[PDB]
């Protein structure tokens, strides 16, 4: 085995084609499927795996009741093949209500945050064994990317946030070598709140499009230099802000130096990346709720500030169908680094006051240099046929 360098150029992206689906909620009506939330996808050099934060119960269970709480002692990081639903044979790789799993070309690294909200432990498990651990430094709900980390030359980089979810918080980039934390650099730059980053390799470093839960409806970008451990940050220059809640396209703005202060009182995990001067991004259809999901390219949206010229729009999920956390993962091609994204479709409480649980499915798209068509790939699970 060899360390992943991601030195290949990012190949041309003209759109996103479906790559995988879960159907977890539909199979939950008859099968024994884990209750999961906040999933992600990470690919080892041969094949792609899906991770989730299971509530320590199945959907057709008495413990699935009131599974809406984001942090319980029983939450575990479930990991399996991309495509195989989270059945009873799933491997719980660690205890976590906030995780980040990613492969360095030799072994998996899992950052798993558990324990009390004020006093939390982040365990760094490499090659199946616990190699490191840190504690909360701000003593306020320590968390991590909730997506895949990025390892360049074996030096994985994770983004750990500690502090208020509606105020200033300390965000640190931890550089980990074979499970051992070799460096820690606090976030520096123009980003005033970094949380739940959707990191992807951009050689020779890492680029993470994070979520601003304090004031910004525009997603901050954090560039991580794995060579000299320098962290820089700004915001997205595109005027089409990809973080909901937000303002509609007519009255939205983003000057990519400060948060826009436009309905920034909350956020959702999202993603974006740069194709030349253009920016590929994904955002929910609704401006207030996490309903629907489109992906589009904004022309000159990475360089020119407040750019609103979108093109190649795709409707991943229709407006009337629930969505959730979305994220980006990179897959090594034959000669390029393809960018793929996943969308979480949340079902249950509190939006649907029919069932008592709160579970999710995942739909995974990948970028293609060829052509594609339209369509919608929602949950497809009728809440009336699901167990209460």
């Amino acid at each position: 085995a060899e360390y992943r360098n991601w030195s290949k150029p990012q190949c041309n992206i003209t759109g996103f084609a479906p790559f995988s689906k879960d159907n977890s909620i539909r199979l939950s009506a008859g099968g024994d499927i884990w209750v999961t939330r906040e999933p992600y996808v990470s690919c080892d050099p041969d094949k792609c795996y899906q991770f989730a934060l299971g509530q320590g119960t199945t959907l057709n269970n008495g413990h699935s009741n009131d599974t809406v709480h984001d942090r319980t002692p029983y939450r575990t990081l479930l990991m399996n093949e991309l495509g195989v639903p989270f059945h009873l044979g799933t491997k719980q790789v660690c205890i976590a209500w906030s995780s980040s799993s990613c492969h360095d070309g030799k072994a998996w690294l899992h950052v798993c945050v558990t324990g009390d909200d004020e006093n939390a432990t982040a365990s760094f498990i490499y090659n199946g064994r616990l190699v490191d651990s840190i504690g909360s430094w701000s003593k306020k709900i320590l968390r991590t990317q909730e997506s895949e980390c990025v390892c360049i030359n074996g030096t994985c980089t994770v983004v750990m946030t500690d502090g208020s979810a509606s105020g200033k918080a300390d965000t640190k980039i931890l550089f980990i070598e074979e499970g051992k934390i070799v460096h820690t650099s606090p976030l520096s730059g123009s980003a005033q709140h970094v949380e739940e980053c959707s990191c992807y390799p951009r050689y020779p470093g890492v680029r993470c499009v994070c979520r601003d839960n304090w004031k910004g409806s525009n997603r901050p970008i954090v560039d991580i230099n794995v060579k000299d451990y320098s962290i820089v940050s700004s915001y997205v220059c595109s005027g089409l802000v990809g973080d909901t809640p937000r303002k509609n396209d007519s009255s939205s703005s983003s000057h990519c130096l400060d948060p826009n202060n436009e309905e920034g009182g909350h956020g959702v995990k999202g993603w974006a990346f740069d194709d030349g001067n253009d920016v590929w991004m994904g955002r929910t259809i609704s401006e207030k709720l996490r309903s629907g999901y489109e992906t589009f390219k904004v022309i000159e949206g990475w360089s020119k500030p407040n750019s609103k010229l979108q093109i190649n729009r795709q409707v991943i999920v229709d407006r009337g169908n629930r969505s959730g956390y979305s994220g980006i993962f990179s897959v090594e091609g034959k000669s390029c680094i393809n960018r793929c994204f996943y969308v979480e479709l949340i079902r249950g409480r509190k939006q649907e006051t029919e069932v008592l649980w709160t579970s999710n499915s995942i739909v995974v798209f990948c970028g293609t240099s060829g052509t594609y068509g339209t369509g919608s790939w929602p949950d497809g699970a009728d809440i009336n046929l699901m167990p209460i």
């Epitope: 520096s188 951009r202 020779p204 000299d228 320098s230 962290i231 700004s234 990475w302």
Partner: antibody, heavy 124, light 109 residues
Framework: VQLQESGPGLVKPSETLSLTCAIS????????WNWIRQPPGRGLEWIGY???????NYNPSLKGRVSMSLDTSKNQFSLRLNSVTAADTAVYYC???????????????????WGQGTMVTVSS | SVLTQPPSASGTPGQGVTISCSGS????????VNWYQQLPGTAPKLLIY???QRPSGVPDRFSGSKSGTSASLAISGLQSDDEADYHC???????????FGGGSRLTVL
């Protein structure tokens, strides 16, 4: 902010040149701090930057004879160039890189604030 | 430097001059370029960043553009106050630092 440089105008060859940059206004806890050098009648040359987080970067062309440090208590930061040669004489500016992306089509206002500079001469 | 500039670039008052920085792939070709104005005897001052943007205070007569692995700074108006050195800085990727390669002195006859 205002960056003020202070160093020995004359440095003997093969000795060590110790420059200092004092920072007013904003404290040295939130940005990267770089040193640039301009030889007389030549263009600017980047020396390296250091942040209080421990993130440091140096110019490989200097052959690792450079050392920079920060002092938040004094709100200052210093350059410790080692084994100076006759070609090391230049005007040394201290500047600030407030962050901002450095890859791709989007950059930032790096070196927005400079210092008036100090003419470090190397001779006997 | 790695960046290459003409030793000088001249133009008559009222007209406009374009100063060119030439870079490599791990250079202006893939990263942005910042244009700094250094008056004779003083510290360099930021004029252009991100190849288009202007700091608050820089006049609109200064404009920037990038063509592949090269960058151009256009100075319209061109009064006698613009006689200064112009440096182009790009974040290099093969050395993980900054490259200037400056030396372009603008004279307005």
């Amino acid at each position: 902010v205002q960056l003020q440089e202070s160093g020995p105008g004359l440095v003997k060859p093969s000795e060590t040149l110790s420059l200092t940059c004092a920072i007013s206004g904003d404290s040295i806890r939130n940005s990267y701090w770089n040193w640039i050098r301009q030889p007389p009648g030549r263009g600017l040359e980047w020396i390296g930057y250091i942040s209080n987080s421990g993130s440091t970067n140096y110019n490989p062309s200097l052959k690792g004879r450079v050392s920079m440090s920060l002092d938040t208590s004094k709100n200052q930061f210093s350059l410790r160039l080692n084994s100076v040669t006759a070609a090391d004489t230049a005007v040394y500016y201290c500047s600030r890189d407030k962050g901002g992306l450095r890859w791709g089509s989007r950059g930032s206002d790096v070196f927005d604030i400079w210092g008036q500079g100090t003419m470090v001469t190397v001779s006997s | 430097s790695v960046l290459t500039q003409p030793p000088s670039a001249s133009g008559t008052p009222g007209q406009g001059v374009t100063i060119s920085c030439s870079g490599s792939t791990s250079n202006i070709g893939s990263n942005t370029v910042n244009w700094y104005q250094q008056l004779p005897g003083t510290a360099p001052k930021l004029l252009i960043y991100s190849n288009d943007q202007r700091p608050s205070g820089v006049p609109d007569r200064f404009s920037g553009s990038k063509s592949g692995t090269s960058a151009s700074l256009a100075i319209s108006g061109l009064q006698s106050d613009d006689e200064a050195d112009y440096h182009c800085a790009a974040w290099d990727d093969s050395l993980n630092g900054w490259v200037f390669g400056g030396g372009s002195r603008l004279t307005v006859l």
